[PDB]
């Protein structure tokens, strides 16, 4: 289709995932925001890396479930992307996959931490939207 600068929209509270320059990750509903354009990439597939095109910062998750942005791509940066039933997409930490840690967003915009996420919630369902 169109392998480019998507906006990750989460169906939980209608936010676009956002990687701010201080390294924090969160959602916002402002389409004008400079920190929501994201490039995704394999190989493969779906093992993706999600990067802010604006800062070059990569989405990553810690060993305690917290999402943050890193300047260096790396092991905590891979995600298992599966097209759901759905047809939404979900992303699971590659490093913490045997535990089901999904990237997710609360209806208030802030992130869920991996341990509090699971299959069946609205928070872990994304749809990549054109910019």
């Amino acid at each position: 289709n169109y392998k480019k600068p998507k906006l990750l929209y989460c169906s939980n509270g209608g936010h676009f995932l956002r990687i701010l320059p201080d390294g924090t990750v969160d959602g916002t509903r402002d389409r004008s925001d400079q920190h929501i354009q994201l490039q995704l990439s394999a190989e493969s597939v779906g093992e993706v890396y999600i990067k802010s095109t604006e800062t070059g910062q990569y989405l990553a998750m810690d060993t305690d479930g917290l999402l943050y942005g890193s300047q260096t791509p790396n092991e905590e940066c891979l995600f298992l992307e599966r097209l759901e039933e759905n047809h939404y997409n979900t992303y699971i930490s590659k490093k913490h996959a045997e535990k089901n840690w999904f990237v997710g967003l609360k209806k208030n915009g802030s992130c869920k931490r991996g341990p509090r996420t699971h299959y069946g919630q609205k928070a872990i369902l994304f749809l990549p939207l054109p910019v």
Partner: protein, 100 residues
Amino acid sequence: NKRAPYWTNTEKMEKRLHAVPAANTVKFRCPAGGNPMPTMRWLKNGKEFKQEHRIGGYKVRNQHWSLIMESVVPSDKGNYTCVVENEYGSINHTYHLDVV
């Protein structure tokens, strides 16, 4: 105790952009209260939304204040506004549907 309408659930309604894959189903809500109990109707892009404007029509559940359209296709894209009224006033809210 005569009162104009008021929303009873502002938290649900702050999710304005509803982006949905077709052929999924979508539900909009605007729970309200008022005395007498208000009525509600939906607009699509600012004008009367009748059954006749979509193949399969749509359901309105008055008991839940909601509007439901199943098998969402591209022509559903648009703004949907719920207008809630009694004889003392009305309140409205708009949602944006976007079908991927």
